[PDB]
């Protein structure tokens, strides 16, 4: 029927999954499946240099076995996972990311704070009402994203080490009285040194309305609710678009802070949370005291509900640009059971470094970018290892399964050798097309061409949005490409 996708974040005190179908109407809408959480604290297995502990590992391919399953178990099929600051920031991030996918075949690629506030931005659109000039801070166990927007995504995003872990673990809490007090305060001063000097960015002006994200803010907005007299947040469904007030989060904040750790536990709402809970609120008041915040409203919404927008606007965005022939590609991959945004995006990049060889001066026949784009559709469709005339479907057919040594060997029968002009084109579009399925070999649909150059006898590729697996998947699929176009040298 219409498209099913899943999405996956890790983040530093757990792991959230999303799966959803899209929306007849190629409007970009989705509908809700299921979703998961998993508690997988990687924050917590951290050591004294960052890196990643044998058990965040483990942790880690953990929760993505049970969303692997999960998105099986909804024909969802391949999982798009980002991975925010205890990967980002752990000196073998890359190693454990490369470790998690040989054991699972998801691969958590990192994206940087910048994006993640701008896709947790979209999120909360899917989630609360936005107004003209909307505030959002998300705390995470790792870091504090700031990001101001209008009514449709973010202008401006700011991204903070102030996340409830790393403050637990920055300032540890003393056994005296004023103990959790002594905590908060010397929390509250982190805030405001680091926020300082970028505050104006998101300081209120007259009608700025703030909205909070993430499981400090959702149980918050529980605790403050269940004080006013109320019933646990899933009475009422959860706590979306739940508003409380500075003041509100200060008293409650006074309470936690005059609370052993234990004893923050059996306060209801943060139930699952007295452990960090103490500098997680703190740096919550402080931020929105430094913003002059006086009100705020939660948000269900987040990181993987803007992973799931983006992903299908790339997707409906590619259809649509896309000549009726090539669209029956896409359908026909579709029935093949393709990932349809995996395939976009290599037909994408083939077709950007295809142009910029042009402009260097590389000659190619007239229907060779229409080839490249359908062997670029088609290239993961088993069953094959409308609009377009035999010869061209076989030209398709030899890009898209491409090898050195070809299976049918040249005298075995039904053999296919196509004329010496015809077989040299397959392997210069093969060699495209392998480059650009390096560059997404990770289902980020993030990877950009920045430059095509001539280098000597060779070429320079210029290269953003690209985890450290996409770049070693050119390295090791390029071959090609410098057999037939010159050494191939990747950068940034
Ligand atoms: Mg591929």
Redesign the pocket.
Known sequence: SHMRVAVADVGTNSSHLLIAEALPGDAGGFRVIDTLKDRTRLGECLDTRGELTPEGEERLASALTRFRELAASAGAGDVRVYATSALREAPNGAEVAERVRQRTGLYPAVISGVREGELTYLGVREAVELGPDNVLLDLGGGSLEFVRGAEERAADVLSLPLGAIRMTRAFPEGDGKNAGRDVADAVARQVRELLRPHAGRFAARPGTQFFLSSGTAEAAADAIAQRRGGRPAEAAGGVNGERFTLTELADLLAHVARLRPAQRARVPGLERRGDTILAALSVLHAALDALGAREVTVSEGALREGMLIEELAQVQTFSLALSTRQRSVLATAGRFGV?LS??GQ?AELSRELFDRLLAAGETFPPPARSLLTAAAVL??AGQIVRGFGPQDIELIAQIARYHRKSLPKPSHPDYVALAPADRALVARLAGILRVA?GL??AHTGLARVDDLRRQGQGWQLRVSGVTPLDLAGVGEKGDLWAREFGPLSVQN
């Open positions: 990932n995996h395939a290599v290239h993961e399925d997404d070999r």
